[PDB]
Amino acid sequence: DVDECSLGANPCEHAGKCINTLGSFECQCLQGYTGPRCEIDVNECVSNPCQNDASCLDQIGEFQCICMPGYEGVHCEVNTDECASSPCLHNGRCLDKINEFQCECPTGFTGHLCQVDLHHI
Ligand SMILES: [Ca+2]
Ligand SMILES: [Ca+2]
Numbered sequence: 001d002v003d004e005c006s007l008g009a010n011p012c013e014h015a016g017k018c019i020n021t022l023g024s025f026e027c028q029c030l031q032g033y034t035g036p037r038c039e040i041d042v043n044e045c046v047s048n049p050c051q052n053d054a055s056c057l058d059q060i061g062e063f064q065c066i067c068m069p070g071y072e073g074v075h076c077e078v079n080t081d082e083c084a085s086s087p088c089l090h091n092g093r094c095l096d097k098i099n100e101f102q103c104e105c106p107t108g109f110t111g112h113l114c115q116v117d118l119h120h121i
């Protein structure tokens with residue numbers, strides 16, 4: 001027949017590589033594109049990749065997750081460790097929460113960070 005890849009413009013959309021065949025042609029699409037002529041912008045959010053109630057952004061050849069507060073990572077799969085800096089004073093036990101921490105203060109200590117000494121009273 002004809003070499004559709006040699007007529008002038010690339011018959012493959014979105015800079016796909018045109019490969020000639022006898023009787024037709026084929027397109028080798030760049031990441032994020034699909035269809036016989038790469039016409040379609042793939043929806044990278046279609047498989048629900050964003051975890052923990054994150055918002056998914058469908059972009060060119062990728063998705064981006066917008067995490068709920070307290071979450072991080074590409075899929076918002078990481079619950080940020082708020083206990084990392086050891087915030088509890090006087091032997092308080094740190095419990096990691098969502099965008100927060102809890103200190104389990106020993107007897108005689110109170111306050112968010114176990115700051116208040118009550119032993120003298
Ligand atoms: Ca052809
Ligand atoms: Ca896309």
Ligand SMILES: [Ca+2]
Pocket residue numbers: 070079080081082096097098099100
């Ligand atoms: Ca946390």
